Paper text:
[name] is a Ca2+-permeable, nonselective, six-transmembrane tetrameric cation channel ubiquitously expressed in mammalian cells and is primarily localized to the endolysosomal membrane. [name] has been suggested to be the major calcium-releasing channel in lysosomes and is involved in multiple important cellular activities including lysosome trafficking, lipid accumulation, signaling transduction, and autophagy. Loss-of-function mutations in human [name] are the direct cause of the lysosomal storage disorder mucolipidosis type IV, a neurodegenerative disease characterized by abnormal neurodevelopment, retinal degeneration, and iron-deficiency anemia. We also determined the structures of the mouse [name] channel in the apo closed, PI(3,5)P2-bound closed, PI(3,5)P2/Tem-bound open, and mucolipin synthetic agonist 1 (ML-SA1)–bound open states.
Residue numbers in the entry:
A (entry chain B), B (entry chain A), C (entry chain D), D (entry chain C): 40 to 200, 216 to 285, 296 to 527
Write the structure that this text describes.
């Protein structure tokens, strides 16, 4: 029959050793996999942190070198308010660029033809964009504008070791002013420490943005970095990671296939013996969710390791997707560690408590999500104009989540005390809104989450 | 009789389909209403955010243009402390106003006669207010003051492209100095993006307030904006919103009326059959609270949509009331979504847990509110002089609420460590006050809220 | 006998009306008392806030007028680091004092003889204190100091509308430099609004403190204010407050005396009937704790009202003690409001839950206080040198309390990440200390408080 | 037999008095020990705080004296960005050092030969370090570097009351620039207050660090202090501490030895009477854990007191280890205070509740630690480049711990809203990561901790 086969299946690894004397291969392989994946992620994180620190420090140096009157911390408020200030900022940026070799503490090299498409072989491009026809005249509300964008460009070349000074900005119809150039440096730490030199090409963009046309022109500098190679153990270890995950995926897929075949045999033998309807959950009882998690983590690790091999060879530079894949896979394997604790009764009590509480917790989350969403919409529409924490829907959701978790509460109240929402009515509404929301979610909703978990634990302890 | 009528009534929509074969019309109509109300609120919020951002950026530009030595973040501390500083601030504001066209990054137009009532056709009014008779002499405490307010005005006209320099401030009897003028600009983003041009008239008020007579004269700039039209789908969609809510209100009112008639028939038939006293709750059992919520949300949505139509046509500019109405209605419909979850048993368990816990929670709120109020009064009276967070009763309440919810606790303690309330006694009292309050409300009151919710859940699970 | 007397006693006010038809006099009198005490405290708080605001604004103006290079917010860091800086600060303070009448926005009058004991009729005293013999010579560690303090004074008189410039500071043996003078002003708001003029005499003290002898000399300005009268309903309302509290105290004391006499009769009649030992709690069962609270609040209100009458007449100026008395009395009466809720069963359930939980809560507080104190001592001794939040024992206690209540946690961790306690060992110890403390108190101690409250509620619900 | 011996053993101190009439000696000795240890730690903390304050104030004065354009709070951002700025900072530091005697408010003495190994008898050493061969040329990626470090030194001597101006920095190959000198001062507070003079020798190090080679050269000043004696009750009290702890350790060790002998007699008598297997816990039942704690605290106190005697005599200066030992011992004795509360039933209820809950709490901590670690690794790898709170693994752990305890939540969300992780994908991942983590740990894990404690309390109350 099959009761002997279903006995060996659905049975603990410790009991599995007693029958047929099968050595635990999947058991040790998963531990080895967890070790190697954690080590690989740690090494990747360390190298990435070094690269990130180099990029950030160089960008800060660029901001102090090219932005007129720049101080640390004033990034989102750095702006120009007069025509002379804008002219001075643009001219200071270009002049500092032209005298960079003998003022800069870092060794940056000019890149010929680095100004972008609007630079035809010139290193720096000084571009101003404006509408084709502005005809803005608020004296008697006579408007006549052609929304076509005109790009006026000035070509700047560094000296071999002043046209741009004759720049006329069409202030009434101006869209933005941009400065494009590239700087090339060599990461010395790589040239000494790991003996693998890295050549960085920073693409500096300085924007004087006037798209709001509000009299305030913010100024920002952003840098894009391209890391080439100047004209191992990690690769071998990344090969070990791929092999271990491949073997783990193979074994887990084999186990899943055997489970599927066994459940098919069971469901046909039920109808053969006593015709009865197989429940959907009973079919789902033959598939081990831990193996689905294991194959998911194996696939994520393999893809992330391929992308990591591409990145380490300076061919991909897609750090975000690779980091997400590796982090998700590592999270999944460290979560899958719980399967070993499910073999011991006293840990299984707590794990089963969480498992039996989870459906009710999800149902209550669905119940309270609609109240949460209504509060989010109401707060965004009413407090959005007046409260800095309510400007966007995502910001409102973050603020309300922190409020229900007991964080940043007094600042939310105090922001509304400052200007009183420019109307006693808005202040009173904010009072009612915040007090009712915080009281409802903390004293009732959180308490009900506690009650659900306590009830699940009570059922587990006394079945 | 009526037991057949009361069976169809008071019965689930799924069961309602089986009897008489009535299609669910109110069911789908409420879903459509929720969708259209949420979409309308999102569109309104996006447009309002654009308008708010334009206003804020222009006001920041005005502050940087007209306030002498202004830096971002120093709004509530910006003040003058000497006579020369006040003169320089006033003169700088007027001079910047007079040279605005050739310094400003935005295109602002002068408004003739924009200085207000004290400007008889002049664009800028420079007004100083002082008492009729001051005779302030602290040398030997000889006071003689006439509380009549005298308004001395200077008329300033922009050049066609210096009387105000002879300004003598009566410093000993001065009340405030104000500068009134208007600037007109065109929101270019509207002129391009939505092809509907908007003409903004900012009314700038610069106040040099000396009403405290404390030697410190704060300086602030506030702007009032009037949005006209320079010389659709939203309107049609707002018509759909009104129609949907009108139909929903009609159906809900019809259902409420039928319920009232049915309960009248029931209460008369009770006395006809067996004379017994109808309980107040039993009469209240015939009215569906969900329909009261639905009609309330329908009325709020209709009023808010009418005001939104008025605002979008540049006729109302009452954004606060319209936003409050729309937000409250959207919150109400998203709360009313719960009625659908009450049809399913496993969600109904949690909803009924909250419902049966609510009366005890309100009773305990009433019990602890008096302790909370006593603490608020005591903290306001004792810690008000010394603690920045205890200056007003509303501020005290906000601080204590954040304290009981575990927020901004260390800052409250640290503010009292700084100056020690200028007396060891006040510091010791603040120690006892804060420790006792936080210990009482967190360890006992919150725990009792948890206990009440747990007890209600236990009663629901095991009736 | 006495069972009829004990029946009328120990009985609810509603039941008390049915027997003997006694009108509730104490019931309405306490409500009136709560009303009048709250109104009195609110009026007192409003007037005190006006006075505090005037004082603070004048002190800020003084700081901007007399402290060289002073900016807002730099109060605890304002210091001098060179001899020239100290000379310049002292000279700037004196020069600004001498030209105050024609630079200051407020109208301050010179006070002749206001420099204190070291000024013999002069308005300003410029005092430097130093040791009699310093002989400080770190070249070869030759010390010879006489700890006697010498006070060298310079007398400064304002002009009728430069000796101090020849000031030589004994820098090696200097203790501090102080500038004493007084300024007289009239609070104009009082001169108009309430028509009761107030004459303020600010005593300005500028300290250049060198008692640390650490090369850094902090500079601070502190002001003492004396409010005289320039050469009602509140008084009548404060008389009503005294009368109401006197009558309440009389009635409550009479009730307490009757209870004492009744318990004496009961305890003698027990021995007369059946000789048995009266329990200590049984004797304590005859005294109503609410009446003890009422007499305490009455006495506090009477004392605070007497002191308030003294203050309002400009005879006391002891605001701290009066405010503490009034606030404590108001807190006590608002707490005593609970007695009315004890008459209704559903509120009595919650109140009795808290009452029966309180002894166990206090016992657990005693149990966990010793662990808390050990953590406080350990953190003060180890993290005190390196952590700004652990400098003093009270500061350590405040930090740990906020930590267990889930506030300011990440900043505490981040302060230790910054310098790592200048030793990996201290950083590791801080890691273990903070993690163990927060885990122990939040996950175990707070949970046990919740469990105690839940158990008390369960006993109350099912006796 | 031994049932009479085991009766006197394993028995409360109050019961122990009734049998054999033994006076409680260990009982009073532990109270005396707690008192003397707390007093000793308080005295040590006060003296250490005075020393720490002197060091910190002198270091702040040094920063204001020697760092060009230094302001308070700008320590981790203080940096140079141009060659001229670096030259000016170095020259300003040396010039201020050379004119220190007539500008400084503190009395600092030059130390001849205080520049360190690179100063051969000179007081100040101005050292620049650079690679032997740099040949850095990013123009065409021609690198040729010799990682050997060359130390170029300039010798500076103070005047008896300019070579360094000819300093040429090899900017392309520069590693760092350091300035070494020593200053000697006498703590005057010690010279007066405690009449024990202290001679401080500060070793000032100014670093211009270019090891990142990123164009930004941070500047920092760090001071090492050596406290000698210029050319009691505490010692006697520290002798009392050693004697008390020695006697306590002797008595506790004697009790532990008697317990071991008694358990050996019991285990042999069991086999003599009825051969049965002694359980491991039963053997562990004979050893009092409180005595192990007492001997541990005694040893820690003795070692810390020896080191404190060494420190107070200016022979050790190892404050960290001594402070850790004393703090840990004081924490242990204040924890051991609980043993007295275990003698009383109502406190024993709560203590036993915690004790029986502890194993399940540890098991659940192990269960949730793997999920926590997976989240830590994922957040470090993905959010590390973009979030300031996720730069290091310890920082990630601290952030997540504060998040689960409801602290610094909105700032974590807002940091990701600012730049959106430079990619919508990273922002969406951070949204999912933070929401899922906070929801899982607060609503489920903390609730299960509460449930475990409640269950343990329920078992204790109803065995
Ligand atoms: C300055 O404004 C212009 C619009 O006038 C922006 O031009 C757009 O640039 C993006 C990306 O470079 C293109 O995809 C669009 O097609 C461009 N639009 C037009 C109309 O040319 C430009 O990006 C702005 N500069 C900055 C730095 O934001
Ligand atoms: C400057 O002070 C005067 C009072 O001297 C304020 O005048 C009041 O203004 C409000 C609103 O404009 C009126 O309702 C009052 O009737 C005015 N009172 C008097 C006595 O004229 C004026 O508002 C203050 N200016 C500012 C900007 O606050
Ligand atoms: C400046 O230092 C002197 C000590 O040299 C302080 O003098 C003490 O002042 C207090 C209160 O005024 C008196 O109770 C003490 O008796 C004084 N001691 C001595 C030795 O005279 C003085 O207070 C300090 N000044 C400031 C502003 O702190
Ligand atoms: C400046 O950089 C040099 C490296 O060029 C650092 O020198 C190291 O110093 C430490 C401690 O002083 C020694 O243990 C190492 O052996 C030194 N390395 C070399 C290669 O000499 C120096 O510490 C740096 N200065 C500062 C202030 O950080
Ligand atoms: Na919190």
């Amino acid at each position: 029959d099959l009761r002997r086969r279903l006995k060996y299946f659905f049975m603990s690894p410790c009991d599995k050793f007693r029958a047929k004397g099968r050595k635990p291969c999947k058991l040790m392989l998963q531990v080895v996999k967890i070790l190697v994946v954690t080590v690989q992620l740690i090494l990747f994180g360390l190298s990435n942190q070094l690269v990130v620190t180099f990029r950030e420090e160089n960008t800060i140096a660029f901001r102090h070198l090219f932005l007129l009157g720049y101080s640390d911390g004033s990034d989102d408020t750095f702006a120009a308010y007069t025509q002379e200030q804008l002219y001075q900022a643009i001219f200071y940026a270009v002049d500092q660029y032209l005298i960079l070799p003998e003022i800069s503490l870092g060794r940056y090299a000019y890149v010929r033809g680095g100004g972008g498409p609007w630079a035809n072989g010139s290193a720096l491009a000084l571009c101003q964009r404006y509408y084709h026809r502005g005809h803005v005249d608020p004296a008697n509300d006579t408007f006549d504008i052609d929304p076509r964008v005109v790009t006026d460009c000035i070509q700047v070349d560094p000296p071999d070791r002043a046209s741009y000074k004759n720049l006329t900005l069409k202030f009434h119809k101006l869209i933005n002013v941009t400065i494009h150039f590239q700087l090339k440096t060599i990461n010395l730490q790589s040239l000494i420490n790991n003996e693998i030199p890295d050549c960085y090409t920073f693409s500096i963009l300085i924007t004087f943005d006037n798209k709001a046309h509000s009299g305030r022109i913010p100024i920002r500098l952003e840098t894009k970095t391209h890391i080439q190679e100047c004209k191992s153990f990690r690769l071998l270890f990344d090969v070990v990671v791929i092999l271990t995950c491949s073997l783990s995926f193979l074994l887990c897929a084999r186990s899943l296939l055997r489970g599927f075949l066994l459940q098919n045999e069971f469901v046909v033998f039920m109808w053969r013996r006593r015709g009865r309807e197989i429940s959907l959950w009973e079919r789902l009882e033959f598939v081990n969710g831990w193996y689905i998690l294991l194959v998911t983590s194996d696939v994520l690790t393999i893809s992330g390791t391929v992308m990591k091999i591409g990145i380490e060879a300076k061919n991909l530079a897609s750090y975000d997707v690779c980091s997400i894949l590796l982090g998700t896979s590592t999270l999944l394997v460290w979560v899958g560690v719980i399967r070993y604790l499910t073999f011991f009764h006293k840990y299984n009590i707590l794990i089963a408590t969480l498992r039996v509480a989870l459906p009710s917790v999800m149902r209550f989350c669905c119940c309270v999500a609609v109240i949460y969403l209504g509060y989010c919409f109401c707060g965004w529409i009413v407090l959005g104009p007046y409260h800095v924490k309510f400007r966007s829907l995502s910001m409102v959701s973050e603020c309300l989540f922190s409020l229900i978790n007991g964080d940043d509460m007094f600042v939310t109240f105090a922001a509304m005390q400052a200007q009183q929402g420019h109307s006693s009515l808005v202040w009173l509404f904010s009072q009612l809104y915040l007090y009712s929301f915080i009281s409802l979610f903390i004293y009732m909703v959180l308490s009900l989450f506690i009650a659900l978990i306590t009830g699940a634990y009570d059922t587990i302890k006394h079945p």
